[PDB]
Translation initiation factor eIF-2B subunit alpha
Amino acid sequence: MDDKELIEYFKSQMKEDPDMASAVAAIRTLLEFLKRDETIQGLRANLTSAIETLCGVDSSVAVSSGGELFLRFISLSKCKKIMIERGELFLRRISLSRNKIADLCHTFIKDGATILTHAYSRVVLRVLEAAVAAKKRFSVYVTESQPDLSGKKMAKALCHLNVPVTVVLDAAVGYIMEKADLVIVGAEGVVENGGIINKIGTNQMAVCAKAQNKPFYVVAESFKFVRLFPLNQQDVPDKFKYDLKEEHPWVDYTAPSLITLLFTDLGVLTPSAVSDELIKLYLAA
Amino acid sequence: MDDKELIEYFKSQMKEDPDMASAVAAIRTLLEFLKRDKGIQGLRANLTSAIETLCGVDSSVAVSSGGELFLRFISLYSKCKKIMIERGELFLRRISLSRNKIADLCHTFIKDGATILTHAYSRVVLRVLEAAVAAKKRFSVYVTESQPDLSGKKMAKALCHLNVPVTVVLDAAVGYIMEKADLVIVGAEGVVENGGIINKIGTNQMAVCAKAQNKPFYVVAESFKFVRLFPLNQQDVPDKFKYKADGQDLKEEHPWVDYTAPSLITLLFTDLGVLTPSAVSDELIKLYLAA
Amino acid sequence: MDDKELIEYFKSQMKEDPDMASAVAAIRTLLEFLKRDKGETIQGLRANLTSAIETLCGVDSSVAVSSGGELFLRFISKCKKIMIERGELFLRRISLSRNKIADLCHTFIKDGATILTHAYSRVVLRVLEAAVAAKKRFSVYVTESQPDLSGKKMAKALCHLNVPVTVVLDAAVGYIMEKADLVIVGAEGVVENGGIINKIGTNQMAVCAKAQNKPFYVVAESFKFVRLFPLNQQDVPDKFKYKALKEEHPWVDYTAPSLITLLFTDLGVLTPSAVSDELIKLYLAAA
C-alpha cells in the first residue's frame, strides 16, 4: 500500500466515524496495509514500522503506542499471515475498552457531584454518558481548551445528554476549582511512571486539584500505555508536542504524584502500579 | 459637569495617555469635577461621590479604591474657602510617584540571566522591567496571551519594542512552562486586607503552579489599590469587580478577575515598601488613616 | 427544641456555671438544639434552622457568640448525619482553649513583675492562676472598671488566690502605668487586623502602655476571631457597642494592632499582623 493512501485511508476512517479514537483508526489502517501487502519477509516487519511513523502525521502518542502494541501482538511459512487474524483479534479486543472503563468507575461518579474536565474526550464522554443513563445526577465544568476550542464541542455533547454544563476559559481553572468535587480526564498517553501526556492544560488542572485536595481521576484505554519515562516537560519528545516568539505545545505532562486513580480496561490502578501493568500486558502470551 | 461629561473626560484621560493607571485617570477627572462643581459642602460631598460610583463604569477595584482614598484624603464663607482642591492636587502628585518607586524596589530582585514569567498586560510590570534593562540586567520573559482580550500579546510587543526577549504562551501552558521560569512577576488590580490580590483571571492558577515548584511569586502594585476586603474564597470577591469588566449549556462563567490568597504570594512591591502578605493589614490602616 | 427552650437552655448552661464563656455556652446550645432537631428532615434544613438559632442566641450582644456561632456552623458540612460528630469534636476543642492559653502565657510572667490588667477577664484569671501554681511571685493592679465594677470582682477573685492586688480608678491608669512591668488583657473579640474589641477603657490603657514602652499582651481564644476590619471606633458595629445634656455609654472600644505587642492564643503566640493568616486557616478549617 502507498503512503499518501496510507494517510487517506487513515484520515477517512476518522471522518466516517468521529466516535473512533485516533489510535484505533491507525492500528486499523495498518491492518489494512498488511492485508493489501509480501516479498522480503523483512519488508514486512519493515514497511509497517516504516509507516506507523508515516501516519505519525498525527503527532499523538496514542498512535505511536497503539501501533507499537499492535505490531508486537502480531508476532510469532510465508503463510505467517496468521498475523492478520491476530490483528483482528487485537482490534476486536480493544473495541470493548471504553465500555469496560465507562462502567469500571460508575461507583466513583457520585450522585449530586460537580465534575471538572478538560477539553474533549471520547472516553470521559462515555464514562459520563454511562452515568446519566444510570440515573446519576451531576453537573459539569469544562475548559474551552485553546486553540481548537474542543472543550466547547465537549460541552455541546454533554448538553445533548441533558447534563448541566458550564464552559469556562482555560485561565479560570484555578478560580472554579473550589466549586468542583473531582476532576476526570482523558489521556493521550499513559507513561511508564503512571504520569500522562495530554492536551496542553492538563498539568495546571492537576496542580490546582492537588492544592485543594480534589481527587484527580484519569480514564484511558490500555493501548495508550507508552514506552516513555519522562520526569518533566522537557523529557517529552517534540514529536508529540507539535525577539518575540510563540510556543504552541499541544500536550503537557502530569507527574504521577498529581494523579489519584487511573481507570483503565485492565482495571483501576494507582499511578505507581502502571509499570508492572505494562509488562504484565506484554506477557500476554 | 454631568455624567456624560465625566465619562468622556475620564476616557479622554485614558486615550490621552494609555500608560496612565485607570485609577489615576479616574481621580484626575474627579479632581476636574470637583473644580467645576457649581453646587454647599454637603452637596459637594455626595456629588463628588454619586459620580465616583458613576466612574464605577469601569468595574475595576482600583478606580474604586483610588476614588475612596481620594475622597478620604480630600475630606475634612467656609464654603468657597475649600482647601480641598489643594489637597486634591497634592494627593494626585504623590500617587503619580508610586509606580516609579516600585520599579526601583523590584528590579533589584531580578537575578541576571533570569527568565521571568508574567500574566496579561501590566503597566507597572512593564515599568519594572524597563528599570531592569536600565540596570544593565539581562533577562527573558514568558507571558500568557490572556483571553479573551489577548492583552498578553500587547504586552509582548511592548517588551519586543524594548528589545527584551519575550515568548507568548497559551493560558493553558503555565503549568507546562513554569519549569522554565525562575520567578513570577505579576501586577494587581487590587490588594486586599489579608495581603491577597485581585487580578486578571488566570492569576490564581499561575501562583498555585508557582508555589508547587517553589518559584517566587512577586506582586508589584501601587498603594491606591489597597482595598478594604478580606476574601476567604473566590465567591467573596464582589460581582461588580468580576463582571462586565475590562439553559442547560452555560458559558455562564466569564469572571474578569480572580483572587490569589496571601499564602500564594511571596512579596508585594509597593510605594509603601517591600511587604509580605501579613504586613499588608498594618500598611492599609496607616494608609487609610494617614490624614 | 423551639425558641423558648434555646434561650432557657443557653441561660442555664451559664447558670450551672458562671465561669463558662458565653460563646461556649452558646455553642453547646447549638449542639443540643441540633440533636433535638430530629423533627427536621433534610440535611439542608438542619443547617438552615440552625442559622435561625444563632440569631436567637444573638440576644447576647457578645462578639464571641457571633464568631463562635459562625465558626461552629462552618465546621459542619442523608436524613442520617454525622454533623453531630463534628459538633462535639468542635466543642471538645474550644474547651481546651482557655487552658492552652494559660500554660502558654504564665511562663512569661517574670518573678517580682507587677502586672496591670483591666476589669474582669476569665482568661486573664486562668493565666495568673497558672503563674502562682508555677510558684511565681507577682502583684497586680486592676481598674475597678465602670459602670459594673467588674474590676472589683476580678480583684476579689485574685485575692482568693493570695495574689497581692490593688484596685484603682479607670482614670488612674495613665498614673499607675509607671509602676507596672507589663499589661495583660482579655478580649471580647479579635479582629482581622490583629486588633481587639474589649471592655471600654482598654483602648486608652493600650495607648498609655505604649507611651511608656510597657509591653501590652492580649490573651484570647480562637473562637473570638471575627470577620471585621475597623479603622477606628465608629467602625465597630453597635450590636456590640450600644452607642456611636446627653450621655454616651459604649460598652466596648477598639484597640488597634499598632497598640498590641502579642496575642496569646490556643493557636500559639501571635503578633497582630499574623492574625489574618491564622483567621483564614481557622475559617477555612474544613478543607
Summary: Chain B touches chain C through 18 residues (CB under 8 Å). Chain B has eleven helices and eleven strands. The radius of gyration of chain B is 19 Å.
